[PDB]
């Protein structure tokens, strides 16, 4: 009974969702995400897995601020003025 | 020295690897001293450090540290170099006088192989394998 | 050709015009003027519009009859002209799309802006023939 019979006892969760990364990999008794290592100020990533880094790098999501800063660089980071009309 | 933090289930390897209790750091106690101040005080730059006493388990040091956003460190052009951004955490990069010595930086012959800079800049050069176009 | 910021790559030229936005796609939507409007305005081509009159040159409709356009359907790189048409199976008149390179503008719709292109595309022909 290592197999079929033992697997019906799976009804408690080892990992709920995670409050930084949104993956269901926050261990509840550890209180530690297995992915981003959440309650720890600094993200968890490693050089022995580049595929995992690839999956949550800058520009895997939205980049809601960075690519306004790229568009503002090319104009010399100008502020407080607007395009006067003509022509 | 540095007890090697292997788990008392000690170092697995070949017998040159087995040393635990007689090894020394590569950075000195004064190096590691102002390192421990630059972390805990991230809002200030470490300039230089200095021995003031010691006995048998604790050497200890003063550390001259500088509030780089003050309106008198920045407005005064002699000290004003370290208010720049290549001086953010210099003591964590080997750039104060104490961290500098561990690196092995000098002229000429005896201080040879860190000759491009770092020590690792020199292994990169000495092992650099130039395939040429015209070759 | 002599500019190093100009690509002769098949790839980058096909990509930069199928992915052209719909205001670069107006200048890509261009048609030659008639030899009387080429002679009246000193303007060779023009971006096509809606109420412009137009004659079809190449392809099955082949033209001597001028009709006006009703859609500059820039999304397909195609125009629809008022009597260039076709039937469904069930007798609905469908417009057949013609590319503007294979069409000939014989009467331009003019307002304050389509006139000012003519006083800009023609002024820059005497200023490019006197070189």
């Amino acid at each position: 009974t290592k197999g079929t019979s033992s697997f019906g006892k799976r009804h408690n969760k080892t990992h709920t969702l995670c409050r930084r990364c949104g993956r269901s990999s926050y261990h509840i008794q550890k209180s530690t995400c297995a992915q981003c290592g959440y309650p720890a100020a600094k993200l968890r990533s490693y050089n022995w897995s580049v595929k995992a880094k690839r999956r949550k790098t800058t520009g895997t999501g939205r980049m809601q601020h960075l690519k306004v800063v790229r568009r503002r660089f090319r104009n010399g980071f100008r502020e407080g003025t607007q395009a006067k009309p003509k022509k | 020295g540095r007890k090697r933090p292997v788990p008392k289930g000690c170092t697995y390897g070949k017998p040159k690897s087995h040393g635990v209790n007689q090894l020394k750091p590569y950075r000195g106690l004064q190096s590691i001293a102002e390192e421990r101040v630059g972390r805990r005080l991230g809002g200030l730059r470490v300039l230089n450090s200095y021995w003031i006493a010691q006995d048998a388990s604790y050497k200890y040091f003063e550390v001259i540290l500088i509030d780089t956003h003050h309106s008198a460190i920045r407005r005064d052009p002699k000290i004003n170099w370290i208010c720049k951004h290549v001086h953010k955490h210099r003591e964590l990069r080997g750039l104060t006088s104490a961290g500098k010595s561990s690196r092995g930086i000098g002229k000429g012959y005896r201080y040879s192989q860190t000759i491009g800079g770092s020590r690792r800049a020199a292994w990169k050069r000495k092992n650099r394998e130039h395939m040429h176009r015209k070759r | 050709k002599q500019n190093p910021f100009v690509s002769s790559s098949r790839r980058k030229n096909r990509k930069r015009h199928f992915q052209a936005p719909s205001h670069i796609r107006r200048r890509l939507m261009s048609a030659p003027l008639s030899k009387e409007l080429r002679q009246k305005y000193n303007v060779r081509s023009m971006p096509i519009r809606r109420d412009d009159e137009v004659q079809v040159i190449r392809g099955h409709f082949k033209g001597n009859q001028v009709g006006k356009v009703v859609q500059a359907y820039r999304k397909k790189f195609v125009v629809y002209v008022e009597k260039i048409q076709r039937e469904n199976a069930n007798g609905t008149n469908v417009y057949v799309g013609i590319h503007p390179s294979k069409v000939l503008i014989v009467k331009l719709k003019l307002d304050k802006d389509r006139k000012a292109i003519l006083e800009r595309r023609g002024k820059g022909r005497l200023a490019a023939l006197g070189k």
């Binding site: 800063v69 980071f77 502020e79 407080g80 | 956003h69 920045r74 407005r75 052009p77 002699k78 004003n80 208010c83 720049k84 951004h85 | -």
Partner: protein
């Protein structure tokens, strides 16, 4: 923007304007020695500056 342009009229002439009526350039650029003293100089270097300028010359026979 009829009300932020009005606050920018009041927080003229005051030092310590709000952080929003204050020039978000980049974090690195806002800190990095405002050039009014990044290129101010010691009195020893202003005195080496005013006695031997780079002369303007040409060489051949």
């Amino acid at each position: 923007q009829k009300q932020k342009e009005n606050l920018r009229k009041v927080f003229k002439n005051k030092k310590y304007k709000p952080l929003d009526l204050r020039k978000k350039k980049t974090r690195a650029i806002r800190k990095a020695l405002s050039p009014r003293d990044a290129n101010r100089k010691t009195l020893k270097e202003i005195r080496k500056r005013s006695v031997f300028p780079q002369r303007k010359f040409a060489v051949k026979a």
